[PDB]
């Protein structure tokens, strides 16, 4: 017998000791080697409750990533609370690596393997493991990149669909690739390419899933209504450079019911001055490096917020929202929980 | 102690724009979402939207399409709202509200113990106009007791308020001066009535003194029975 | 989404007020108190949980898709208007206003022909005066050539008088000069507890 419990986890990874790459260096000092023969015990006739929206593992992953970014992605100038801090900003090698989160002795991680599991409630197929799967710490807004895919059908996850303030995580079941590039020889101008045939098909599917939860109402996509560039644009980090991309074209109502079947190209820009996602002030990094910078990633999830209102209409409007970068972690950790044995 | 201080009131013209501010204090500013509530006098509290001090993302109400904007200043700890396309239906009090709780990194709540004092925004065509006083002769005989019924009609004026005194503050017995109601013209108009003995109609002269300090208009009007 | 009833309560200092509110969803519900001219104030939330500074004379309660705020021994500051809230939505409200008990009094009904100085403007206003009556509950309708009138009648009531404890009401009928001269007979109907039958004071346009 066991009970739900919190404790400090540790990490394991396949970090390379010979790498100068920044995720590798960090993990070399903060994590241990992985287990080549991981143990997983499936529990027959065991039912456990999970709540992805109340999981301290999510909180724990954030602290690690903050520490990692604080040691590595140091800026040329750092502006926080009215003061100016300068401390060199060398270019780094940056490419997220998978990190496993593990329980110490006297604890274990229960893992929900129930397909189409929405993240809250009972799970019928439960197994026990010492460590999670390898989770890449991809920091992004609007679109979840390089994450894990839904195992069956697309899953809509929310702490409370009725509550417009709770962020909706759409967990996709098929990887639509996004190809972003800043071509060699305005050095800060960039763009992302997405297969319009694949994407519009999937977006159409998301509408159908949303219809099941919202009584078959008309689903409308709209651009973000306001805020900092990190939220109104799709922001992420590519090869050390901070990309900001206009996703207006991705959430095109027209293609959800001709003309668009081609390649979709979003305008992007690399910024040197960024509002740090850790929530403080501004940070200035060096100008983008030279040559062709390219990262191809899978969109594996979408973060949405639904519009609030006291109207009596038949439509619901959705915008690529988000909130805490922690939500990104929730989408991957939703199937895990820590318990203390006896 | 949590304190939300909104900006002062104001007057506007149909088509103008206002920026109501809300300076917050007594708590950690980022850890709490802020909401905006309007309230047309004689209407249920209508929700405008919320804003996240962290990122700055905003959730506008669908019932008010493109008639608002919300911003914040994380350093000065202050939220803003811009009422655009000002109309007659935008005449309301606007509140700056923060949720209870928290002990969480973001506070969404929807439980509101902390309100601002509100902000009065009155949108009406131009102004100012003085009161036009029309008499209300009782007059051609009543029934069921005698007791005449006479008054004045303070109609079409702006803004609030006006004060009506009968016969220079002398007649105080049985005087009912109704509160002002906003008309379709965006102007105010009230009625002040008095019940007097019907026998003293052809003897005593009744005067109503309507004083409007804003438009600088003091007018006295005699009210007497019709002649036919 | 949220049905709050009743719209108004006329009760006396010491009596018990009960305010109900329906819900479509099953999320938590809260209660606010708004004294005249002031900002709202939290009283009840999460169904029945009491707020800070709020005495135990207040008590929230839930039943089915319905929530109930009950107030015992009304205490001056208890007067105003209360609103039920669920998420972003708000109930229509219920104005808890003070009503002093006394003997039922009949309203003195009068009708006012528009001023001939006002007719020069082109917006005639026929006024129907109802003064000194009890209780507050009453109803007025307009009949232009024996026909119901709606969408052009404004009302305004006085506060309960200090002496006789009676109310007075002001019904105003606004018509255009062209439409006012089209018809002849103008009268207002008055239904009240102090009356056996709907009294009607009538006047014809022009004649006197
Ligand atoms: C039940 O859980 C096991 C554990 O991984 C999984 O392999 C299996 O697919 C689950 N059952 C169904 C019907 O998916
Ligand atoms: C992207 O998806 C493909 C298959 O959909 C997979 O083979 C590849 O490893 C994924 N890349 C990631 C998750 O970075
Ligand atoms: C993805 O999920 C959707 C659910 O809307 C389902 O219809 C579709 O078949 C799934 N695609 C797969 C499993 O390849
Ligand atoms: C998730 O599944 C549980 C259990 O069936 C259900 O109670 C809850 O409403 C679901 N939530 C969403 C967002 O689908
Ligand atoms: C919303 O969440 C609350 C608790 O946080 C719960 O009582 C309620 O049932 C949820 N709503 C839905 C539709 O599941
Ligand atoms: C991505 O786009 C660049 C230029 O637009 C191209 O050179 C590259 O081959 C593309 N990658 C893939 C996988 O299509
Ligand atoms: C996008 O994917 C579809 C497969 O459904 C393929 O037919 C099409 O050629 C792709 N588009 C491009 C530009 O390669
Ligand atoms: C994105 O592009 C559209 C043009 O379709 C533009 O109207 C919008 O302002 C852009 N968004 C931002 C944040 O600049
Ligand atoms: C959406 O797609 C249609 C069809 O391809 C296109 O005409 C329209 O401009 C698109 N909307 C944008 C780019 O905002
Ligand atoms: C996603 O993975 C691909 C390779 O799997 C990598 O090139 C890309 O940089 C990753 N995305 C981000 C944002 O790091």
CSV table of C-alpha atoms in Angstrom, one decimal, chain B residues 44-160:
chain,number,residue,atom,x,y,z
B,44,UNK,CA,-25.9,43.0,-13.7
B,45,UNK,CA,-22.1,43.3,-13.3
B,46,UNK,CA,-20.8,42.7,-16.8
B,47,UNK,CA,-17.4,41.1,-17.1
B,48,UNK,CA,-15.0,42.8,-19.5
B,49,UNK,CA,-11.9,40.6,-19.3
B,50,UNK,CA,-8.7,39.7,-17.5
B,51,UNK,CA,-5.0,40.3,-18.0
B,52,UNK,CA,-1.9,38.3,-16.9
B,53,UNK,CA,0.9,40.6,-15.4
B,54,UNK,CA,3.4,37.8,-16.3
B,55,UNK,CA,3.1,37.7,-20.1
B,56,UNK,CA,0.4,40.3,-20.8
B,57,UNK,CA,-2.1,38.1,-22.6
B,58,UNK,CA,-5.7,39.2,-22.4
B,59,UNK,CA,-9.1,37.5,-22.5
B,60,UNK,CA,-11.7,39.9,-23.8
B,61,UNK,CA,-15.4,39.3,-23.4
B,62,UNK,CA,-17.2,38.2,-26.6
B,63,UNK,CA,-20.3,40.3,-25.8
B,64,UNK,CA,-18.2,43.5,-26.2
B,65,UNK,CA,-16.5,43.0,-29.7
B,66,UNK,CA,-13.6,45.3,-30.2
B,67,UNK,CA,-14.6,48.0,-27.7
B,68,UNK,CA,-11.8,47.6,-25.2
B,69,UNK,CA,-8.0,47.1,-24.7
B,70,UNK,CA,-6.0,46.0,-21.7
B,71,UNK,CA,-2.4,46.7,-20.8
B,72,UNK,CA,-0.1,46.6,-17.8
B,73,UNK,CA,3.1,48.1,-16.4
B,74,UNK,CA,4.9,45.5,-14.4
B,75,UNK,CA,7.3,48.0,-12.9
B,76,UNK,CA,4.9,50.7,-11.8
B,77,UNK,CA,2.4,47.9,-11.0
B,78,UNK,CA,-0.6,49.4,-12.8
B,79,UNK,CA,-3.3,48.1,-15.2
B,80,UNK,CA,-5.1,50.1,-17.9
B,81,UNK,CA,-8.3,49.9,-19.9
B,82,UNK,CA,-9.2,51.9,-23.1
B,83,UNK,CA,-12.9,52.3,-23.8
B,84,UNK,CA,-13.2,53.0,-27.5
B,85,UNK,CA,-16.2,53.7,-29.8
B,86,UNK,CA,-17.9,55.5,-26.9
B,87,UNK,CA,-21.7,55.3,-27.1
B,88,UNK,CA,-24.8,55.6,-24.9
B,89,UNK,CA,-24.4,51.9,-24.0
B,90,UNK,CA,-20.9,52.6,-22.6
B,91,UNK,CA,-22.2,54.8,-19.8
B,92,UNK,CA,-21.2,52.8,-16.8
B,93,UNK,CA,-19.0,52.4,-13.8
B,94,UNK,CA,-15.8,50.4,-14.4
B,95,UNK,CA,-14.1,48.3,-11.7
B,96,UNK,CA,-10.6,47.0,-11.2
B,97,UNK,CA,-10.7,43.7,-9.4
B,98,UNK,CA,-8.2,41.2,-8.0
B,99,UNK,CA,-8.9,37.6,-6.8
B,100,UNK,CA,-8.4,36.3,-3.2
B,101,UNK,CA,-6.1,33.3,-2.5
B,102,UNK,CA,-3.2,32.4,-3.5
B,103,UNK,CA,-0.1,30.5,-2.7
B,104,UNK,CA,0.2,29.6,-6.4
B,105,UNK,CA,2.5,31.0,-9.2
B,106,UNK,CA,-0.5,32.2,-11.2
B,107,UNK,CA,-3.7,33.4,-9.5
B,108,UNK,CA,-6.8,33.1,-11.6
B,109,UNK,CA,-9.3,32.6,-8.8
B,110,UNK,CA,-12.6,34.2,-10.0
B,111,UNK,CA,-13.3,34.9,-6.4
B,112,UNK,CA,-13.2,38.7,-5.9
B,113,UNK,CA,-12.8,40.2,-2.4
B,114,UNK,CA,-10.6,43.1,-3.6
B,115,UNK,CA,-12.3,45.9,-5.7
B,116,UNK,CA,-11.3,49.3,-6.8
B,117,UNK,CA,-13.7,52.2,-6.0
B,118,UNK,CA,-14.8,52.2,-9.6
B,119,UNK,CA,-14.7,54.9,-12.3
B,120,UNK,CA,-17.7,56.9,-13.6
B,121,UNK,CA,-17.8,57.4,-17.4
B,122,UNK,CA,-20.7,59.4,-18.8
B,123,UNK,CA,-20.9,59.4,-22.6
B,124,UNK,CA,-23.5,61.8,-24.1
B,125,UNK,CA,-23.8,64.3,-27.0
B,126,UNK,CA,-21.7,67.4,-26.2
B,127,UNK,CA,-23.5,69.3,-23.4
B,128,UNK,CA,-24.1,71.5,-21.5
B,129,UNK,CA,-27.8,72.5,-21.8
B,130,UNK,CA,-29.9,74.2,-19.2
B,131,UNK,CA,-33.3,72.9,-17.9
B,132,UNK,CA,-36.5,73.9,-19.8
B,133,UNK,CA,-39.3,74.2,-17.3
B,134,UNK,CA,-42.8,73.2,-18.5
B,135,UNK,CA,-45.7,73.8,-16.1
B,136,UNK,CA,-48.2,71.0,-15.2
B,137,UNK,CA,-51.6,72.6,-14.6
B,138,UNK,CA,-53.8,70.3,-12.5
B,139,UNK,CA,-56.4,71.7,-13.6
B,140,UNK,CA,-59.8,71.2,-15.0
B,141,UNK,CA,-61.3,69.6,-11.8
B,142,UNK,CA,-60.4,66.4,-10.1
B,143,UNK,CA,-62.3,64.0,-7.7
B,144,UNK,CA,-62.2,61.6,-4.8
B,145,UNK,CA,-61.1,64.1,-2.1
B,146,UNK,CA,-60.4,67.5,-3.6
B,147,UNK,CA,-56.7,68.3,-3.0
B,148,UNK,CA,-55.3,69.7,-6.3
B,149,UNK,CA,-52.3,68.1,-7.9
B,150,UNK,CA,-49.8,70.5,-9.6
B,151,UNK,CA,-46.1,70.6,-10.5
B,152,UNK,CA,-43.2,71.5,-12.8
B,153,UNK,CA,-41.3,69.5,-15.5
B,154,UNK,CA,-37.5,70.0,-15.4
B,155,UNK,CA,-36.8,68.5,-18.8
B,156,UNK,CA,-33.7,68.1,-20.9
B,157,UNK,CA,-30.7,69.3,-18.9
B,158,UNK,CA,-27.1,68.2,-18.3
B,159,UNK,CA,-25.4,67.3,-16.1
B,160,UNK,CA,-26.5,66.4,-12.6
